[PDB]
Curated annotation (Swiss-Prot), chain C:
Na(+) 2 binds at residue 336. Regulated by L-cysteine, which can either inhibit substrate influx or trigger substrate efflux without being transported itself. It catalyses: L-glutamine(out) + L-serine(in) + Na(+)(out) = L-glutamine(in) + L-serine(out) + Na(+)(in); L-glutamine(in) + L-serine(out) + Na(+)(out) = L-glutamine(out) + L-serine(in) + Na(+)(in); L-threonine(in) + L-glutamine(out) + Na(+)(out) = L-threonine(out) + L-glutamine(in) + Na(+)(in); L-threonine(out) + L-glutamine(in) + Na(+)(out) = L-threonine(in) + L-glutamine(out) + Na(+)(in). The keyword Membrane applies. It is a multi-pass membrane protein. Optimum pH is 7. Glycans are attached at residues 121, 164. The keyword Phosphoprotein applies. It comes from Homo sapiens. The lineage of its organism: Eukaryota, Metazoa, Chordata, Craniata, Vertebrata. This is Neutral amino acid transporter B(0). Na(+) 1 binds at residues 334, 338, 423, 427. Placenta, lung, skeletal muscle, kidney, pancreas, and intestine. Expressed in CD34-positive hematopoietic progenitors (at protein level). GO terms for biological process: amino acid transport; erythrocyte differentiation; glutamine secretion; glutamine transport; L-aspartate import across plasma membrane; L-glutamine import across plasma membrane; neutral amino acid transport; protein homotrimerization. The chain holds residues 43 to 488 of 541 of the full protein.
UniProtKB/Swiss-Prot annotation, chain D:
It comes from Homo sapiens. It is found in: Cell membrane. The gene is ERVW-1. It is a peripheral membrane protein. This is Surface protein. It comes from the Eukaryota.
Amino acid sequence: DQVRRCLRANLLVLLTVVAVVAGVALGLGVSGAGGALALGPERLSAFVFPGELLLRLLRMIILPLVVCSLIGGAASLDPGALGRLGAWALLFFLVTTLLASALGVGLALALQPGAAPSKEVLDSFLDLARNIFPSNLVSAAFRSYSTTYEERNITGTRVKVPVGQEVEGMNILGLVVFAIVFGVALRKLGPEGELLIRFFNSFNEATMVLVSWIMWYAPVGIMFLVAGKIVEMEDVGLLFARLGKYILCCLLGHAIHGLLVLPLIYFLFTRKNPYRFLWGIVTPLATAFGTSSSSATLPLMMKCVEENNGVAKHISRFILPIGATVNMDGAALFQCVAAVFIAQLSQQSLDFVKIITILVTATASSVGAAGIPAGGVLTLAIILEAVNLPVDHISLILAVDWLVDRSCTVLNVEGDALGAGLLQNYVDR
Amino acid sequence: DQVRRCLRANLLVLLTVVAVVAGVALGLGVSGAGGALALGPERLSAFVFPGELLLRLLRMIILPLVVCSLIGGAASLDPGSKEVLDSFLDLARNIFPSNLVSAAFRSYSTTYEERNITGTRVKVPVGQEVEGMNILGLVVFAIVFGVALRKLGPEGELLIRFFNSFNEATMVLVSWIMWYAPVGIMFLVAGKIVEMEDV
Amino acid sequence: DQVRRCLRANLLVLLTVVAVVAGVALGLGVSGAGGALALGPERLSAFVFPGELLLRLLRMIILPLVVCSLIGGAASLDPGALGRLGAWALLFFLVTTLLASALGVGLALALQPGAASAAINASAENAPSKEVLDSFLDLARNIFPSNLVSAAFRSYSTTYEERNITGTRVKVPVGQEVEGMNILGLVVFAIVFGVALRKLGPEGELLIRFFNSFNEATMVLVSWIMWYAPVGIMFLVAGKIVEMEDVGLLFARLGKYILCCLLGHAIHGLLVLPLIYFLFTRKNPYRFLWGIVTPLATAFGTSSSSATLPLMMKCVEENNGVAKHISRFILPIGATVNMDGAALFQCVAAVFIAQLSQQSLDFVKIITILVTATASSVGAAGIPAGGVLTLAIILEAVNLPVDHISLILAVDWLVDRSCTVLNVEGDALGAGLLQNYVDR
Amino acid sequence: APPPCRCMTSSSPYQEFLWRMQRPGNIDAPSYRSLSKGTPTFTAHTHMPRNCYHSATLCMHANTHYWTGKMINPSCPGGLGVTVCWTYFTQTGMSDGGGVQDQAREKHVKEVISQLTRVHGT
């Protein structure tokens, strides 16, 4: 029968979806029988370890993959054509992020879910600009830049001056920029750069082989990640009774943006079926929901967009690594909804100017956010300081952060893939 | 015109000179009307930010532009506070950095402390690999690696070509960066004139 | 003359042994006619600096050499053949580790180092311990490192947050990346990248040529460093003898423990591994030992298996001519996996600690201490004093007192060098058996 | 003789989340269960690198000696500019590149050498 052949052809999709469902079921079953209280610390850690192993495996290869893929993509197109494609890509990213932020603000205002060193927003923007252009490639491979305030003048004149220091991270934005510039420079040379192009292409192909092995391992890690995240709950009833409206706002905004807005944009600009593209990219979406990080599912997204969908290699390898960092619609909607929720918690009114600042700072924060689990929580402080009325009690946002963060990751990777397909059609025209 | 050709060919040096002059003018303008204390350090950082950006761009290219083309030069020449002793030991340790990747973003240094409080106040020197970027160790390793590639026969030709192509690409980035430079020197000069006062 | 040709051919090994002898003599002379007191700390640092320079030179080479050699070795052999060879290598490594651990336990039980126990001589506070499950999770996390660049200079290790000392302590574990090269993760990534490169094809061929040329240049650097190595070995030995105080007085009651450790190391290195080599290859093991003398003396001087790995690789390549691919695949793996001397040390030390506190050893305790010593020898760091953490894990697993760990750190400076010698000898002998097998 | 330790847990869960997210080698978001809750209590780390504090001093809590100091990097345990406490000795077989824990380790082993040599003399 053709059913077995179809199952064999779509074994990866079925395995990943069943892994997610079985992770949910196993988490619920273990939580019912003890809720980790009977498990204890050592058994709980042994239970949650395989998901951490999968996350480490996927983070192991992200740096060489991004660097080599971006070098190859930037060296595969003329500087004028690459510049035009990049301009269109950033225009699409900005428009989608603004739409997501506006939808989040509007939905949070409609449903009303609401009812320590500081950090200046100018310094945050300067930190983002400094992270765009790193001062040391090897140092930027494993850590980023952040500013610090200290009192160095006399005690009579106490003013905060900003000093700079390196904090732990990955600084993917500066490496992305350097890889793009290096690829453009390599194509600028003639036969001299061909050896380097072949070198980086070979390195990328080997990284893709490791990607294939790791994604074949992935479903067990996804299942254990979901099960461990579900088990760690403390008081489901009280937590839901407190944060149900906020969770509903976030999830409804994500669902509306991912099922109505982006498919409409893709259909308007392409006159094709966006849901066929979504069916092609189901597996990276399920991986993003399992791992809650856009960087870990980036290789699977590139492979699925290249193979399942008719997208050229250079277009995907140039667009997807950039969008995995700078295009974060789900994080924007999260941060806007959370800012409105926190403002309503403290009974602080928001007029037009506060809403505009929320939108702009949310776009900037989504640009600056990292593709790591709970990556959008950190820039929520930047947004709250921009509004400067919502003192940073983001502790109430947590304890439901994993699920909404997973939805944010799904929305971000979906926006990236849809933009890649739109640009592929625009190039084809 | 010949003068037009002279202006077009030597555009970069004249742009740099004009940038220095305009940076001086902007520095005196800010330090005069308005006041250097009115904006404060918070706005001064944003005012001098383009110079910091130029400095960061210049510092980002030092490691490849050194390591590549030092391997290139060494393989193509062909055969024909701190005390004196502790500073010398630090210099010797930085020549052989003991870790190639760690040498790219930090360097060895010796610091003194009075941890041995028993008896007299003896100064015990310790090293902790402070933040640096370590020109010396990378330079020595690149020269030695280039000489070793020269000692190899046709086997090292692939590595020589690889590093030469990397150096050429780095030179292309250098040429691109030096076009942004006049804004950087302008803002650096303006910031230095604003910060100090001697007139 | 024949004697002149003999010295010219074997000039390096004679320089190395003369350097070791001169270092011992110079250390004894300086300690007798002075020491750390007659000359100041600055003079001591200037005196011991050349050995530190040699150690830094050897440590600079480890990362590119290991990465390129393992990539080439994994890409030069079929995945099935590589898997079979790795299975045989791991079988040999664990067999040798069990034999060394059993010999150490037997000697420690026969000679009774902790029978007298002097006057207990233990209290300040108790050092924090690391759980066995946490250590195994740390090993599994160090496999497949999260960041490739960060793994070149730092490695993951779990710590603890002692909360509520009066309030029913929970000891919440929190992990972080601490200083120290992650050799095992780089080894695993290099092997996987090599097999992926072979699976690719012509692109893999280009990358193979790149990494092989890099490895050859690194070997040229190793050849240059190996000539300076005897002076660094001499100064290491002399400075380590001079710095350590009141010889003999420390040994007067630690002689049983020292005799157990060194006798176990000598028996394993002169009667077990040579016997296995002779029974599997029918050659002369002592010719192999003569070929590998100067990596052994380098290991004794530096007390670090990773530092002497390039010299051992080169000496295995030129003398007793194991093929390049099999040697460059076997030696890096055994440099971080095969540790016979370390396991013998930890078994003897744990039995001695148990006898210090007058605790029974029974049978299941011996079995589990052997198993945990074997399972924790793998993944241990090749840096000096790298067996202390694994010994602590063993003590935690066996439920023995920890406060007597200071006696182990008291005299570990020499026996650790003996352990390094035994580990690199086991590496070389395993390479010899595999080379003889592939010759057939 | 050492002064009592003032080393409490994080006042808010967000600060604990922020400093545990930026630790070196962080791979996943910390769970809400692992975050400290309720009133602050005494806490102590079992390892701390020397490059996290400018200076350290001894403190007493429940008749046990601890090292205390102020952190200078947000990636260091406890946060940025937060007075934290850590144990007198580090974990066995673990080193923090010098610092107070190491200096205590060599001090203890040298005391052991001195007393054991005195035992030999008797």
